[PDB]
């Protein structure tokens, strides 16, 4: 049983490898060879939000495409007004090392987590007129890498202890535990219908989870190093991942395999952020060489560059109406492009 | 109102920006340290009215390649050493040669003839300064271990970060962080 199961485990690895190749009748780069490419996309910095003292690890857009939360490692959680560049809130965090932040789709709460292994939920709309921490989702055994609201009372978090968790905010206990990853779960992405979510870990693997049942549906290999970023296609039938191998890859949930690879010879730095446009035709990816590279998600052609940051680009997010792209970086600046 | 909803928004912004200015004074007055070797423990000690903040990582997994690039802007990484000696020589090798910790200095606190065969043909340098009482067996071992970490430091130093090996104090960390800041200032002026 100690090794007769390792022999049986690869009997299914080669069976899944053959079911994925039998359906690989074509290539995304073969059937999109006749579509017209996108023009050279030259987006310029519209706003530059200053006010963070240290590195910025995460930002998240609001659903109204106007407010955005930002998380810096100096111990602040600043809520901005992207149109006016006015700071709306500034929440002093108890732990200084926060690696993620989320914005509730209602706009009432913001999440935050980091090396304290705790997800803090901050109530923005309080009657007494202040931002107070409402809940502290403790019990996750490893640093929080990502967190995403499902409702005002439900949130999925990934942690560095190889485990994702689904929390009921009012009671404060995990309703589901998503185990199966081998390394630190570094990011997660919710589906547009919030029925599934995908997560990438440090084992060069990405898993598709079912929020309601709690099982792992599909596992997507193909990357060579830790997956640092992940994002669904706008229609929720595909997702893109970013890895330390310096490539991005597009996986299809139904074909159950990798469709396209976004790599370049002059690129030898890891991808820290991955986001899609509103249409899904573009693929904006933040890198370690301090600039972002807009890709043509249908032809794998480098379409543009967002080069305005002085340090490593950490976070990157597109508005819900596709109007602007906000990127944070270790130089403590948030630049909004268009 | 288009005009009164923006003045009340600039009235709140100026109150946010005047508080971030006070927080910037405390953030720059404090020196952040990472003790290496809840989810993170904070130790706020003070030496001669200088605020320090040591952060023991606490309850994290044995895989550090992801949460250790958080501590790339700390003043110094305090590396405590206690085979367990070669494992600390490889952990120092990765911290020293990491692309994000290449500007962070390391303060080394050092709390065997079979694990290291080059220890037999090793003579204590005449530059050694021991206090009387230590037999030549422990003094030759204290300086051989120190010469193993300085071999990693002098191979890839380049002038961005420095190693401060010691033997076993917070006064040494106080005196070593001042040397780190002074060299950081001399490097900005290109005097070094």
């Amino acid at each position, epitope marked *: 049983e100690l090794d007769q199961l390792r022999q049986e485990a690869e009997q299914l690895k080669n069976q899944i490898r053959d079911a994925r190749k039998a359906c690989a009748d074509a290539t995304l780069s073969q059937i999109t060879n006749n579509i017209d490419p996108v023009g050279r996309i030259q987006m310029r910095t519209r706003r530059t939000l200053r006010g963070h003292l240290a590195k910025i690890y995460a930002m998240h857009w609001g659903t109204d495409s106007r407010l955005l939360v930002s998380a810096s490692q100096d111990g602040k959680l600043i809520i901005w007004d992207s149109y006016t560049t006015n700071k709306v809130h500034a929440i002093p965090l108890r732990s200084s090392w926060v690696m993620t932040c989320a914005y509730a789709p209602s706009g009432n709460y913001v999440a935050c987590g980091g090396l304290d292994n705790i997800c803090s939920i901050y109530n923005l709309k309080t009657r007494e007129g202040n931002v107070r921490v409402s809940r502290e989702l403790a019990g996750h055994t490893g640093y929080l890498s990502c967190c995403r609201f499902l409702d005002d009372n439900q949130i999925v978090t990934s942690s560095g202890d190889t485990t994702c968790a689904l929390w009921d905010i009012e009671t404060g206990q995990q309703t589901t535990t998503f185990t199966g990853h081998t*390394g630190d779960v570094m990011s997660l992405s919710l589906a547009p219908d919030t029925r599934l979510f995908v997560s990438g870990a440090c084992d*060069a693997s990405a898993k598709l989870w079912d929020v309601r049942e709690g099982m792992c549906r599909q596992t997507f290999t193909g990357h*060579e*190093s830790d997956i640092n970023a992940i994002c669904f296609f706008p229609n929720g039938n595909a997702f893109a991942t970013g890895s330390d191998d310096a490539t991005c890859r597009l996986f299809d949930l139904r074909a159950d395999q990798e469709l396209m690879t976004y790599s370049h010879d002059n690129i030898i730095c890891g991808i820290t952020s991955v986001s899609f446009s509103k249409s899904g035709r573009l693929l904006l990816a933040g890198y370690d060489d301090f600039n972002c590279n807009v890709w043509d998600a249908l032809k794998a052609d480098r379409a543009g560059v967002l080069a305005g940051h002085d340090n490593r680009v950490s976070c990157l997010g597109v508005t819900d109406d596709g109007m602007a792209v906000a990127t944070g970086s270790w130089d403590s600046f948030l630049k909004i492009w268009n | 109102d288009q005009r009164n909803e923006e003045k009340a928004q600039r009235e709140a912004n100026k109150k946010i920006e005047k508080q971030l200015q006070k927080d910037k004074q405390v953030y720059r007055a404090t020196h952040r340290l990472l003790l290496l070797g809840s989810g993170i423990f904070e130790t706020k000690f003070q030496v001669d009215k200088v605020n320090f903040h040591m952060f023991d990582v606490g309850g994290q997994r044995d895989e550090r390649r992801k949460w250790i690039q958080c501590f790339n802007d700390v003043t110094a990484i305090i590396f405590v050493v206690a085979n367990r000696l070669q494992e600390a020589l490889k952990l120092f090798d*990765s911290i020293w040669n990491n692309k994000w910790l290449r500007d962070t200095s390391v303060i080394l606190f050092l709390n065997i003839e079979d694990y290291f065969p*080059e220890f037999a043909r090793y003579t204590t340098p005449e530059d050694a300064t021991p206090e009387p009482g230590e037999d030549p067996r422990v003094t030759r071992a204290k300086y051989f271990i120190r010469d193993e970490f300085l071999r990693i430091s002098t191979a*890839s130093g380049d002038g961005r970060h420095y190693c401060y090996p010691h033997f076993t104090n917070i006064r040494r960390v106080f005196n070593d962080c001042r040397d780190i800041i002074q060299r950081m200032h001399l490097r900005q002026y290109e005097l070094l």
Partner: nanobody
Amino acid sequence: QVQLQESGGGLVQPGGSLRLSCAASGFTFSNYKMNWVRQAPGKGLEWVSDISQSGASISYTGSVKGRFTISRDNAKNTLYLQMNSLKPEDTAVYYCARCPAPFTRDCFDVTSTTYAYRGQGTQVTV
């Protein structure tokens, strides 16, 4: 998929030689620094030897210098470990560890926690 399969191994008399192999798959072998990591029965994982992306900056642990020699073949994606004059304290499960990022000089690949980029090990008994 990153796959590292170790071969060689086997029981050998004290003083005999042994050659370990490592067939790598699912990644560009030339971009990574490869390691060798063992686990003695009763102890934890300890690092044995590493080799650079090309094969220039070779390193060993003190207990194996002069006996072991690590070598790689980037043309066929194979990592080697020629173990000469073995002694009974070299009995362990030898893993072919790869450190996670390419084009780097730092590796964190001896973790007692489940580490992803290393093989299943080959048993060496002396």
